[PDB]
Structure formats: C-alpha cells, structure tokens
C-alpha cells in the first residue's frame, strides 16, 4: 500500500517538477530581462543627464 | 474393499472434475493476481525513474 501512495505520489511530483522546470526558467528570464531593460534605461537616463549638463556648462 | 474402489474411483471422478472446472479458473485468478502485482511493482520503478 506504501509503494502505491508512493508511486502516485512520484508521478504527481514528476508531473509537477517538468511544470516547475520550465516555470522557474521563465521567472529566471523574465528577471535577467527585467535586469537588462533597467540597465538600458539608466544608462539613457545618464546620458541624457551628461547632455544637459554639458548644455549647461556650454551655454555658461 | 468393494467399497474402496468405489470411493477411490468416485474421488477420481471428483479430481477430474476439479481440473477441468476449479482449476482454471482459480489458475486465471492467480495470474491475474500476480500480474497485477508485477504491474504495480513496475509501475513504482518507472515512477521513480520518470
């Protein structure tokens, strides 16, 4: 009776670890997406600080 | 003496019927018994595996 629930039991957490397989890889993407997106972000957000700085200081 | 071979031919009688009738059956049973464990005992070992 133990190696039936057993056995149920192990199809139930294969079928769940193929599904937390592929929903940890998509969490893990979307961070290092999410990652990426706000680098770009501030790296335009501090180029656009440089450019108005150096308006000002040219215009000074 | 006379009632010895007549009881003795009568379980004759008795154990042809039981093989032909009983044991069938009760042999389909067993198999079907022990089939069935075999599956689950497979069954088990693929689960582990998947």
Do not use: C, H
Not at chain 1, 34 to 47: I, M
Not at chain 2, 22 to 43: D, G
């Amino acid at each position: 009776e133990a190696m039936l629930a057993k056995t149920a039991a192990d199809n139930r957490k294969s079928a769940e670890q193929v599904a937390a397989a592929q929903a940890d890889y998509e969490k893990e993407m979307a961070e290092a997406r999410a990652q990426a997106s706000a680098l770009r972000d501030e790296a335009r957000a501090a180029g656009r600080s440089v450019v108005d700085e150096k308006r000002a200081q040219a215009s000074g | 003496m006379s009632i010895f071979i007549g009881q003795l031919i009568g379980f004759a009688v008795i154990a042809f019927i039981i093989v032909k009738w009983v044991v069938p059956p009760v042999r389909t049973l067993m198999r079907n018994q022990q089939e069935a464990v075999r599956a689950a005992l497979a069954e088990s070992a693929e689960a582990a595996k998947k």
